[PDB]
Design a protein around this motif. Structure first.
Motif, PDB file in Angstrom:
ATOM      1  N   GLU A 169      -3.543  -2.152  -8.233  1.00  0.00           N
ATOM      2  CA  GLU A 169      -2.471  -2.729  -9.043  1.00  0.00           C
ATOM      3  C   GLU A 169      -2.677  -2.486 -10.536  1.00  0.00           C
ATOM      4  O   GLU A 169      -1.718  -2.311 -11.294  1.00  0.00           O
ATOM      5  CB  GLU A 169      -2.375  -4.232  -8.779  1.00  0.00           C
ATOM      6  CG  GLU A 169      -1.936  -4.596  -7.382  1.00  0.00           C
ATOM      7  CD  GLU A 169      -0.467  -4.308  -7.132  1.00  0.00           C
ATOM      8  OE1 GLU A 169       0.247  -3.944  -8.088  1.00  0.00           O
ATOM      9  OE2 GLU A 169      -0.026  -4.459  -5.974  1.00  0.00           O
ATOM     10  N   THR A 170      -3.930  -2.493 -10.962  1.00  0.00           N
ATOM     11  CA  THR A 170      -4.230  -2.257 -12.362  1.00  0.00           C
ATOM     12  C   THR A 170      -3.813  -0.839 -12.726  1.00  0.00           C
ATOM     13  O   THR A 170      -3.097  -0.629 -13.709  1.00  0.00           O
ATOM     14  CB  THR A 170      -5.718  -2.454 -12.640  1.00  0.00           C
ATOM     15  OG1 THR A 170      -6.065  -3.812 -12.358  1.00  0.00           O
ATOM     16  CG2 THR A 170      -6.036  -2.157 -14.101  1.00  0.00           C
TER      17      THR A 170
ATOM     18  N   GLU B  70       0.132  -0.399 -12.439  1.00  0.00           N
ATOM     19  CA  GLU B  70       0.875  -0.911 -13.583  1.00  0.00           C
ATOM     20  C   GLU B  70       0.658  -0.028 -14.804  1.00  0.00           C
ATOM     21  O   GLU B  70       1.565   0.154 -15.614  1.00  0.00           O
ATOM     22  CB  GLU B  70       0.444  -2.353 -13.870  1.00  0.00           C
ATOM     23  CG  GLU B  70       0.978  -2.964 -15.161  1.00  0.00           C
ATOM     24  CD  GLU B  70       2.486  -2.862 -15.300  1.00  0.00           C
ATOM     25  OE1 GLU B  70       3.195  -2.859 -14.268  1.00  0.00           O
ATOM     26  OE2 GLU B  70       2.963  -2.799 -16.453  1.00  0.00           O
ATOM     27  N   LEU B  71      -0.543   0.528 -14.926  1.00  0.00           N
ATOM     28  CA  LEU B  71      -0.861   1.407 -16.044  1.00  0.00           C
ATOM     29  C   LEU B  71      -0.010   2.666 -15.912  1.00  0.00           C
ATOM     30  O   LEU B  71       0.503   3.188 -16.901  1.00  0.00           O
ATOM     31  CB  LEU B  71      -2.352   1.779 -16.027  1.00  0.00           C
ATOM     32  CG  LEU B  71      -2.957   2.553 -17.208  1.00  0.00           C
ATOM     33  CD1 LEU B  71      -4.460   2.596 -17.045  1.00  0.00           C
ATOM     34  CD2 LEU B  71      -2.398   3.969 -17.291  1.00  0.00           C
TER      35      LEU B  71
ATOM     36  N   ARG C 298       2.953   3.018 -14.398  1.00  0.00           N
ATOM     37  CA  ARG C 298       4.333   2.720 -14.749  1.00  0.00           C
ATOM     38  C   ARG C 298       4.483   2.670 -16.266  1.00  0.00           C
ATOM     39  O   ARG C 298       5.493   3.105 -16.815  1.00  0.00           O
ATOM     40  CB  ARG C 298       4.774   1.379 -14.152  1.00  0.00           C
ATOM     41  CG  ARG C 298       5.132   1.427 -12.673  1.00  0.00           C
ATOM     42  CD  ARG C 298       5.730   0.099 -12.222  1.00  0.00           C
ATOM     43  NE  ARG C 298       4.764  -0.990 -12.333  1.00  0.00           N
ATOM     44  CZ  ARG C 298       3.937  -1.368 -11.361  1.00  0.00           C
ATOM     45  NH1 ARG C 298       3.953  -0.751 -10.184  1.00  0.00           N
ATOM     46  NH2 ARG C 298       3.081  -2.361 -11.571  1.00  0.00           N
ATOM     47  N   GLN C 299       3.460   2.153 -16.939  1.00  0.00           N
ATOM     48  CA  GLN C 299       3.482   2.031 -18.389  1.00  0.00           C
ATOM     49  C   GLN C 299       3.326   3.320 -19.188  1.00  0.00           C
ATOM     50  O   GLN C 299       3.986   3.488 -20.212  1.00  0.00           O
ATOM     51  CB  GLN C 299       2.405   1.049 -18.844  1.00  0.00           C
ATOM     52  CG  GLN C 299       2.897  -0.365 -19.062  1.00  0.00           C
ATOM     53  CD  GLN C 299       1.778  -1.294 -19.457  1.00  0.00           C
ATOM     54  OE1 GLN C 299       0.957  -0.962 -20.309  1.00  0.00           O
ATOM     55  NE2 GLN C 299       1.737  -2.468 -18.843  1.00  0.00           N
ATOM     56  N   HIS C 300       2.465   4.225 -18.733  1.00  0.00           N
ATOM     57  CA  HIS C 300       2.229   5.460 -19.474  1.00  0.00           C
ATOM     58  C   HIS C 300       2.521   6.784 -18.779  1.00  0.00           C
ATOM     59  O   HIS C 300       2.629   7.806 -19.452  1.00  0.00           O
ATOM     60  CB  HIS C 300       0.776   5.516 -19.969  1.00  0.00           C
ATOM     61  CG  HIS C 300       0.368   4.350 -20.816  1.00  0.00           C
ATOM     62  ND1 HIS C 300      -0.147   3.187 -20.287  1.00  0.00           N
ATOM     63  CD2 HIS C 300       0.394   4.173 -22.159  1.00  0.00           C
ATOM     64  CE1 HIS C 300      -0.426   2.345 -21.266  1.00  0.00           C
ATOM     65  NE2 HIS C 300      -0.107   2.919 -22.412  1.00  0.00           N
TER      66      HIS C 300
ATOM     67  N   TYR D 163     -12.661  -2.763 -17.726  1.00  0.00           N
ATOM     68  CA  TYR D 163     -12.355  -3.266 -16.393  1.00  0.00           C
ATOM     69  C   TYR D 163     -13.224  -4.434 -15.926  1.00  0.00           C
ATOM     70  O   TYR D 163     -13.751  -4.433 -14.813  1.00  0.00           O
ATOM     71  CB  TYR D 163     -12.371  -2.153 -15.340  1.00  0.00           C
ATOM     72  CG  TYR D 163     -11.648  -2.575 -14.070  1.00  0.00           C
ATOM     73  CD1 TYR D 163     -12.266  -2.488 -12.819  1.00  0.00           C
ATOM     74  CD2 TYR D 163     -10.363  -3.116 -14.126  1.00  0.00           C
ATOM     75  CE1 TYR D 163     -11.621  -2.934 -11.661  1.00  0.00           C
ATOM     76  CE2 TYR D 163      -9.711  -3.565 -12.970  1.00  0.00           C
ATOM     77  CZ  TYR D 163     -10.348  -3.475 -11.747  1.00  0.00           C
ATOM     78  OH  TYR D 163      -9.727  -3.957 -10.610  1.00  0.00           O
TER      79      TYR D 163
ATOM     80  N   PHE E 109      -8.138  -5.176 -18.861  1.00  0.00           N
ATOM     81  CA  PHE E 109      -7.051  -4.937 -17.926  1.00  0.00           C
ATOM     82  C   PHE E 109      -6.106  -6.103 -17.674  1.00  0.00           C
ATOM     83  O   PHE E 109      -4.940  -5.884 -17.346  1.00  0.00           O
ATOM     84  CB  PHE E 109      -7.613  -4.416 -16.597  1.00  0.00           C
ATOM     85  CG  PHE E 109      -8.313  -5.459 -15.760  1.00  0.00           C
ATOM     86  CD1 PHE E 109      -7.678  -6.016 -14.656  1.00  0.00           C
ATOM     87  CD2 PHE E 109      -9.624  -5.838 -16.038  1.00  0.00           C
ATOM     88  CE1 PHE E 109      -8.340  -6.936 -13.827  1.00  0.00           C
ATOM     89  CE2 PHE E 109     -10.300  -6.755 -15.222  1.00  0.00           C
ATOM     90  CZ  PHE E 109      -9.657  -7.305 -14.111  1.00  0.00           C
TER      91      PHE E 109
ATOM     92  N   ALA F  62      -3.521  -6.570 -20.491  1.00  0.00           N
ATOM     93  CA  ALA F  62      -2.772  -5.319 -20.530  1.00  0.00           C
ATOM     94  C   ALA F  62      -1.985  -4.958 -19.277  1.00  0.00           C
ATOM     95  O   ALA F  62      -0.913  -4.362 -19.377  1.00  0.00           O
ATOM     96  CB  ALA F  62      -3.705  -4.170 -20.889  1.00  0.00           C
ATOM     97  N   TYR F  63      -2.488  -5.315 -18.103  1.00  0.00           N
ATOM     98  CA  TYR F  63      -1.790  -4.937 -16.884  1.00  0.00           C
ATOM     99  C   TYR F  63      -1.566  -6.001 -15.808  1.00  0.00           C
ATOM    100  O   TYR F  63      -0.526  -6.001 -15.149  1.00  0.00           O
ATOM    101  CB  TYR F  63      -2.517  -3.751 -16.242  1.00  0.00           C
ATOM    102  CG  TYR F  63      -2.849  -2.635 -17.206  1.00  0.00           C
ATOM    103  CD1 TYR F  63      -1.841  -1.944 -17.879  1.00  0.00           C
ATOM    104  CD2 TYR F  63      -4.174  -2.284 -17.466  1.00  0.00           C
ATOM    105  CE1 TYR F  63      -2.142  -0.934 -18.793  1.00  0.00           C
ATOM    106  CE2 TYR F  63      -4.490  -1.269 -18.376  1.00  0.00           C
ATOM    107  CZ  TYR F  63      -3.467  -0.601 -19.040  1.00  0.00           C
ATOM    108  OH  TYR F  63      -3.764   0.373 -19.970  1.00  0.00           O
ATOM    109  N   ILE F  64      -2.521  -6.908 -15.627  1.00  0.00           N
ATOM    110  CA  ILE F  64      -2.411  -7.906 -14.562  1.00  0.00           C
ATOM    111  C   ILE F  64      -1.832  -9.288 -14.853  1.00  0.00           C
ATOM    112  O   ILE F  64      -1.306  -9.928 -13.940  1.00  0.00           O
ATOM    113  CB  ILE F  64      -3.798  -8.087 -13.875  1.00  0.00           C
ATOM    114  CG1 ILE F  64      -4.239  -6.760 -13.257  1.00  0.00           C
ATOM    115  CG2 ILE F  64      -3.738  -9.152 -12.787  1.00  0.00           C
ATOM    116  CD1 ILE F  64      -3.270  -6.207 -12.222  1.00  0.00           C
TER     117      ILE F  64
END
Ligand SMILES: NC(=O)c1ccc[n+]([C@@H]2O[C@H](COP(=O)([O-])OP(=O)(O)OC[C@H]3O[C@@H](n4cnc5c(N)ncnc54)[C@H](O)[C@@H]3O)[C@@H](O)[C@H]2O)c1
Ligand SMILES: NC(=O)c1ccc[n+]([C@@H]2O[C@H](COP(=O)([O-])OP(=O)(O)OC[C@H]3O[C@@H](n4cnc5c(N)ncnc54)[C@H](O)[C@@H]3O)[C@@H](O)[C@H]2O)c1
Lengths: 544, 546
Positions: free
Chosen positions: B141-142, B145-146, B148-150, B313, B335, B338-340
């Motif tokens: 998931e980390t 999501e990263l 999708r973001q970059h 992480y 993380f 930023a992502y979770i």
């Protein structure tokens, strides 16, 4: 002006939840608290709730809380409520807990200004404070034990020097007096002295050292007990007595040294001047306060080298002097390893109870009960008789009475029985201070110099809270920094209500067993023989 | 070798206590733990019990423990047992807790050599570890999501560089791969590499940087996913990859930087040499390890400055660098913030369950169960499909599956139903990692950069443990220092047993509500809008609200 409701009429849906509401209110009763207008109960800024908005939200939640529901309190702020069981605690509290690397006053204050913090001390934020009486027996026993160790079992004809006449420190004078001694206690705020005089915790007061010493010598000579409040700044007065050659037998202290910003007034400043110093230049205040405490401690050490018995009475003042460069600040011991620990090994502690009825007749009834349940314990009866004669109730009538493992359960069940039959006019709250045999970790106080060096282990304090919640307490609390300040302690509290029901009989037998039991196993694990013995004697399971 | 009992045969007086015994043993299963001969489960020296004597005493206590009794465990040692209630937890645990001023590795090691301490990490000392799968979805998931973001929503065509192929770090390779990406994971111990390979958490291995780069390039072009374990020391390897201008899209790390003495091998020493250095001169060792971790982080900062997406992480490596003099060690985020974090606002987290039966059929059955209960949720179906397809079981067949508030109660009560009718061949343990929406306080990880600045507040972790005890979980734990090391975190764990009884239905409904419920009220209190929304939507009580 907030005060606990009296009588048998409820404001809540059940007696257990009304008990919480009354004890919360009692904590802020003008007769009880030091500065309730600001939610302060004692020990610096030890508060009952985060702020007034929070205070009122808790009251509302408590009145609508169901018999099988649990309210969550985070640093004096009600933050949640979930369905549990009738045997689970009605309230769960976690106050002032900070991640270790951030557990200091600097970060606490930063969070406080943002409205994210509150200092619960021990009983302030967990609603189980009963005025100056709460620590009274604790202070009395400490001095009594010191007496047996150095003065033949009495303080008759001895002079004690100390400072700090606040909520808890105010009990020092009566404690020395009950041990037949003479004592001079220095207090910088005359208002504080008056509170102690009015509540019968101190005999006289004076602003002149000459008068104070004249009264002390006269009483010491006639071998009569006497408490004297001396208006002044200890950092200064102690050195004056020291350089005057006055004979002082015992020296200790109970100023709020655990809080450099609020609990200690820097030498050379009047209260007004100190208040401005504190408000305008807080960092300057602290540096100066710390310097004063270093000096205050140098005086205590000088007395010890001069021959007087000196000990730290749990305000972390030795640490403050240490932090300022006084390498030998710890040349004198803490009262626990020196005088009280043996009591802990038997599961004893500041066990206490309050009458929600508000009628002192209930306390007198519980007092006679004590003699009925433990007919062979002379000391217990001697203590109850002193309490009845010298203690003046504050807020809801209450009683401080150190009971050990087994004795607690037996008393709790008996109390519940009298509530059921009506001999006790209303339910009674059973609690204690967080300073207890198995509820706290504090290297500079309760767990100072454990024989095995486990001083810093905080697991037990956490286990105390966990098991008492499982056992069925009424409200369990977990605090950080109580007594000694940020970063120096972790501890748990437990309160259970005796409302006379069969449910209470069940829960009380369980929690009144686990709470002190925790204390026995913690000391047995450290290698304290008496504790190891008590375990075998009363079937307390010790796995290895 | 130790492993959990299998079948319907009981060694304890009841299934709840039996569940404890089996998860405790499952924690030390050769298939599950990293170094069970020393009671080590994962993350440096996270253990299951203080020492072997403590281990056997726990077993004995668990076998005689009654339905209404509670065992007390203090830093992996059974220290007491008291009568409570049928609904109260069977075991209460407090591991590694130290008074703040003494909450550092120096005092921990001093107590540990005196036989007075044990590091419980998160799930090592609380017996709810399930091999590398435990953190797998979290890591997936980390990176997801990263992506999708970059990178448009996929790692296909990207190369990730990391390090640490231990029990938890070993899930990194598969996590990137499941995201269609390419990854090179540096690991200094080949036995660790083989472990990941055998468990199917990593595709290939090599000790040649040249070979590794060639495999990655080949795959990144062909647009195929591929995980490569690179034998070496990150402190040295990452600077070589940096100085040769390798194009690296993403950089993170998962060595055991949280414990300088055990978790990081200083550059220039063989494993054998580092062992001696560690035993003989522990202080010198730590100094050298910190020196190497600083160099390691300097490389990570260089990659970022070079254009790669970099993140911490959760092993506190940034802190170790900062403490060494790297003033800008915190230039890349953790993380969670930023992502979770958004997931926690839904009350989601590494929720998990294990089949005491020992039969994988039970797990496959729960996989189908999930879909039945949440037939609309495409994301949930996709995750469970990937897990069943890519995850090879370790010890008791178990499943990691993130469920949020409400979803946990539903799945837990349904599972219990199946245990009652017999479709599930034996009771199943329902638990999670201590990293979750409302069970931890950790400024350098889970609560890093709370929007209200409440990072260091530890009250909630305590309340979590307290509420779940009151709610009726099977075993509650409160640890200190998990994940990030001494002094940096306070957190609580919770495990509940679905044994088919009605007592469980009631307890399950209560505790699977409070546990995630705490996560909602903690983020809502911090001011997270979604958290406030979920509270309103689900009627979660926020006392200050009128
Ligand atoms: N050992 C124990 O069992 C125990 C129990 C409870 C509290 N305490 C500790 O005892 C201390 C006092 O608690 P409290 O409730 O009385 O605190 P308090 O804040 O109510 O009172 C502190 C007193 O210190 C006085 N003071 C400050 N500087 C002084 C100076 N230079 N000279 C003379 N007096 C000075 C104040 O005027 C005040 O009256 C705290 O550190 C608290 O944490 C110990
Ligand atoms: N963020 C999360 O959700 C999460 C979850 C669990 C654990 N963790 C953390 O992740 C870290 C690793 O956990 P783990 O269970 O894999 O630990 P582990 O101790 O099992 O494995 C650590 C690995 O690091 C390797 N290593 C040490 N120095 C190295 C170097 N210089 N170069 C390459 N490899 C090196 C070791 O050989 C070992 O295989 C810990 O800090 C742990 O606390 C994070």
């Amino acid at each position: 002006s907030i005060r606990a409701n009296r009588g048998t009429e409820l404001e809540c849906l059940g007696w257990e939840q009304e008990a919480v509401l009354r004890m919360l209110r009692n904590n802020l009763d003008p007769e009880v608290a030091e500065k309730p207008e600001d939610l302060i109960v004692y020990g610096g800024i030890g508060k009952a709730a985060r702020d007034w908005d929070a205070f009122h939200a808790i009251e509302h939640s408590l009145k609508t809380l169901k018999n099988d529901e649990t309210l969550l309190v985070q640093s004096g702020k009600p933050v949640g409520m979930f369905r549990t069981h009738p045997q689970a605690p009605r309230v769960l509290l976690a106050n002032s807990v900070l991640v270790p690397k951030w557990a200091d006053w600097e970060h606490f204050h930063e969070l406080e200004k943002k409205g994210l913090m509150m200092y619960g001390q021990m009983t302030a934020g967990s609603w189980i404070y009963i005025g100056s009486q709460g620590i009274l027996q604790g202070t009395y026993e400490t001095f009594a034990e010191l007496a047996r160790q150095h003065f033949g079992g009495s303080l008759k004809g001895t002079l004690t020097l100390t400072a700090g006449l606040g909520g808890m420190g105010g009990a020092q004078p009566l404690s020395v007096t009950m041990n037949e001694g003479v004592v001079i206690a220095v207090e910088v705020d005359e208002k504080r002295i008056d509170k102690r005089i009015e509540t019968k915790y101190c005999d006289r007061k004076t602003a002149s050292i000459e008068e104070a010493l004249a009264w002390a010598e006269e009483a010491k000579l006639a071998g009569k007990p006497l408490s004297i409040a001396l208006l002044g700044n200890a950092a200064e007065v102690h050195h004056t007595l020291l350089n005057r050659g006055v004979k002082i037998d015992i020296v200790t202290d109970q100023t709020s040294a655990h809080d450099p910003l609020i609990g200690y007034v820097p030498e050379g400043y009047s209260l007004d001047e100190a208040d401005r110093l504190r408000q305008d230049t807080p960092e300057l205040y602290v540096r100066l306060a710390k310097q004063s405490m270093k000096k205050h401690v140098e005086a205590m050490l000088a007395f010890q080298q001069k021959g007087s018995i000196v000990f730290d009475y749990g305000n972390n003042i030795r640490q403050v002097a240490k932090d300022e460069g006084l390498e030998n600040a710890f040349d004198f011991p803490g009262f626990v390893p020196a005088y009280i620990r043996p009591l802990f090994c038997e599961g004893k502690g500041p066990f206490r109870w309050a009458a929600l009825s508000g009628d002192p007749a209930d306390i007198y009834r519980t007092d006679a009960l004590l003699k009925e349940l433990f007919p062979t314990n002379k000391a217990l009866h001697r203590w109850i008789d002193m309490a009845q004669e010298k203690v003046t109730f504050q807020g809801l009538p209450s009683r401080i009475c150190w009971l050990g493992y087994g004795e607690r359960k037996k008393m709790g069940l008996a109390i519940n029985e009298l509530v059921r039959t009506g001999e006790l006019k209303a339910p009674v709250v059973i609690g204690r201070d967080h300073l207890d045999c198995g509820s706290v970790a504090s290297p500079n106080r309760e767990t100072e110099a454990m024989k095995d060096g486990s001083d810093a282990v905080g697991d037990w304090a956490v286990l105390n809270a966990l098991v008492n919640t499982a056992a069925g307490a009424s409200w369990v609390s977990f605090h950080h920094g109580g007594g000694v300040g940020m970063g120096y302690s972790l501890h748990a509290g437990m309160v259970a209500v005796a409302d006379g029901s069969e449910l209470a009989d069940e829960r009380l037998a369980r929690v009144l067993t686990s709470d002190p039991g925790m204390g026995i196993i913690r000391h047995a694990d450290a290698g304290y023989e008496r504790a190891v013995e008590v375990a075998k004697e009363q079937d307390i399971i010790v796995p290895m």
